[PDB]
Design an enzyme around this catalytic site. Sequence first.
Site, PDB file in Angstrom:
ATOM      1  CG  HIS A 175      -2.042   1.073   1.155  1.00  0.00           C
ATOM      2  ND1 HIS A 175      -1.729   2.392   1.464  1.00  0.00           N
ATOM      3  CD2 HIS A 175      -3.394   1.047   0.981  1.00  0.00           C
ATOM      4  CE1 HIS A 175      -2.824   3.133   1.421  1.00  0.00           C
ATOM      5  NE2 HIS A 175      -3.852   2.341   1.140  1.00  0.00           N
ATOM      6  CD  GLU A 195      -2.526   5.007  -2.626  1.00  0.00           C
ATOM      7  OE1 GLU A 195      -2.522   6.182  -3.079  1.00  0.00           O
ATOM      8  OE2 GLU A 195      -3.347   4.166  -2.981  1.00  0.00           O
ATOM      9  CE  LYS A 250      -2.679   5.454  -7.024  1.00  0.00           C
ATOM     10  NZ  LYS A 250      -3.469   4.858  -5.936  1.00  0.00           N
ATOM     11  CG  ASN A 251       2.905  11.895  -4.433  1.00  0.00           C
ATOM     12  OD1 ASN A 251       2.154  12.889  -4.588  1.00  0.00           O
ATOM     13  ND2 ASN A 251       4.121  11.998  -3.860  1.00  0.00           N
TER      14      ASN A 251
END
Lengths: 368, 368
Positions: free
Chosen positions: B223, B227, B230-231
């Site tokens: 996770h 995440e 993606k950022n």
Amino acid sequence: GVPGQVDFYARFSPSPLSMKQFLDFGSVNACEKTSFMFLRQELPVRLANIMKEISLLPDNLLRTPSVQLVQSWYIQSLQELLDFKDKSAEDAKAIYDFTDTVIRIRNRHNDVIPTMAQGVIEYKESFDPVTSQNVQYFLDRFYMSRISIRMLLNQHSLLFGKHIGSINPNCNVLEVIKDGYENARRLCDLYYINSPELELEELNAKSPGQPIQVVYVPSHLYHMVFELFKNAMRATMEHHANRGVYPPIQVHVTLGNEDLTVKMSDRGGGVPLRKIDRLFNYMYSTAPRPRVETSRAVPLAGFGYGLPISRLYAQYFQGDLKLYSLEGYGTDAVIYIKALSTDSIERLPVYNKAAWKHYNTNDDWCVP
Amino acid sequence: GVPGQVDFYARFSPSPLSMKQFLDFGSVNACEKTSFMFLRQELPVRLANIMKEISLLPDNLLRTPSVQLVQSWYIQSLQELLDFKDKSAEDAKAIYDFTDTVIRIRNRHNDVIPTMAQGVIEYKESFDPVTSQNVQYFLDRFYMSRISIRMLLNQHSLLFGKHIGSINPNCNVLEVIKDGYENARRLCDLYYINSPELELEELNAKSPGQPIQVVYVPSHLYHMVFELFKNAMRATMEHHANRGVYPPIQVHVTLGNEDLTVKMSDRGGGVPLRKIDRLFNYMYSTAPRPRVETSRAVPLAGFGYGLPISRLYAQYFQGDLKLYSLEGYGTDAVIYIKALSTDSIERLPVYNKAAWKHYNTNDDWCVP
Ligand SMILES: CN(C)C(=O)c1ccc(S(=O)(=O)c2ccc(NC(=O)[C@@](C)(O)C(F)(F)F)c(Cl)c2)cc1
Ligand SMILES: CN(C)C(=O)c1ccc(S(=O)(=O)c2ccc(NC(=O)[C@@](C)(O)C(F)(F)F)c(Cl)c2)cc1
Ligand SMILES: [K+]
Ligand SMILES: [K+]
């Protein structure tokens, strides 16, 4: 009487100025009268505010000879300044006299930082986690206060006794970094008989290809970079001792829309996250100064709180200084400076109920 | 009655377990009885503690249909668990029944995170900085609490209904990073029609040249990395749109003595320091979920609090997740994980006077 005067002035709040205001004041026909009118209130306000917190220190620290000396210096400067609250802005002799007094105070206070540090050594040597939070809180505020007082004393002394006082409107950031590097490098060579090279890169994102310049106090920027180079150099020389090949220090400078950033990256082995904050803890880094009577090189870390004080300089004008370490690899240190002079506002401690509570106080999470 | 039961259990403090304890419990002949004895107190304690804070939310948030639904789920699970405080550890039917109940609760609570997020959207849409500090404080605690509850429910459900429950004793860190990258990369390609390459380097400083492995929940690590990719990918694709050449994402993994660190570096243009913390602010990142009824690619940032929740996962086991950006250049994101299972202790919010004050409370520095 002194406690009367300290109580009167400590009720007031210090008044922060911006870098732009400091600059515009002194740029064209700086007014001595106007400076007198501001500082005859403001310097007593700043002095009295921080004096109130010196009084709240643990008794065994307050009673050290070095802290007693600093307090006496403050008491005297306060008293000398207050001789003038009755005088007229129109009294030219009073203005002359005030300016003389400012210049004299500037000299008396020259040694304030290491004398205070000597106090903490005296206290540590002869004597507690209960009050070690209080000392940390105090020293951040006392040293920031001192930075702000010395700014005012310097501005007025330099203007009246291309730079505007201590301010360079076109501070050449890379030149100062290079100056920091070369001085740190000399000390590195003296102690380790070797030193890392510098790799320096810049990006002016706001105006690509142009020199990076900010309105700034160059000696403030110099202090941060030099202290960080020493830190990066020490870790590098200590980690790589055995192989005898020392990775260079890499520095990346960017000017963005709002932030000037200086990133300094070393391969010095890092520090676990549990311990990284000790670099900014006064008690943890309180080490006896080495003796004068030797020719042995001075280490790149020890007396004088280089790293916490560097961070106070960054934060003084609403900037910051942050460390990020990867244990077993190395460490990044980042200075953040406001690109705009109007955003560069003094960060000033204030004495009041909230400050007092903080000395006399001390949970919603499970304790690990 | 419910407020009676919530008040009884909320007096207790949650009890944190270490990764080592979770591991040693389940490793060899995990005991269902023992697990029942712990969880019949502990799950009601954890539930009741956080329920007390749901009650302190601003009325316009608490009264949203999505928050009402989450609260009702908690109320029901609490009640079902409390049917068992009277039953015997020796009653095999009671143990069977408890295990069934845990498994059922695990399913009921599956959608808790986005249902809560939908609550904040409902509240934002129809309705304040006074209480926006309260919502930030609450959501950190509520989502950390939920992470801890879901850990217990999963451990017990997987053990009794090489991995020990959800724990991999030999989690292959680089494999999980690569899995995160490949999934983020698919989404990047869908939205921007292009994506950055990955450059991955590792340093096992504790045992050089050996694979880096930790005892960990792999889906937690997945996770955070997904995440963060993606950022990093979003910033990269958005900054470099015009030139059409996308610098790669660079990831450096180190295992030190105490810290496992994953550094992720992008050239996405960065964010000024003034704004960087908005990435972790719930209200600031509260965006309506896009409609189902479209084939247009989903953006790499928006619904569901990917970044604050990633940081909660890091901090749950005494790790951390930090961002450092150089405005106009790019950004580093660093995950810190404890290398040792005995150092990996649940970080649990506790309801008490200090928690309550924090909702009903609100200075020693000059305001800039
Ligand atoms: C033309 N002119 C003087 C201005 O634009 C101006 C006038 C006043 C201000 S100001 O913000 O009120 C201000 C800004 C700075 C000072 N004073 C000083 O800079 C010094 C020399 O007294 C100090 F010691 F540094 F504080 C003062 Cl007395 C006032 C700023 C700019
Ligand atoms: C042989 N053996 C079982 C042990 O070494 C042991 C015994 C007890 C503990 S412990 O710290 O008290 C402990 C550690 C974990 C649990 N329980 C669980 O792990 C679960 C399955 O109930 C949980 F849901 F995850 F919490 C319990 Cl009930 C006790 C840890 C290890
Ligand atoms: K005051
Ligand atoms: K409690």
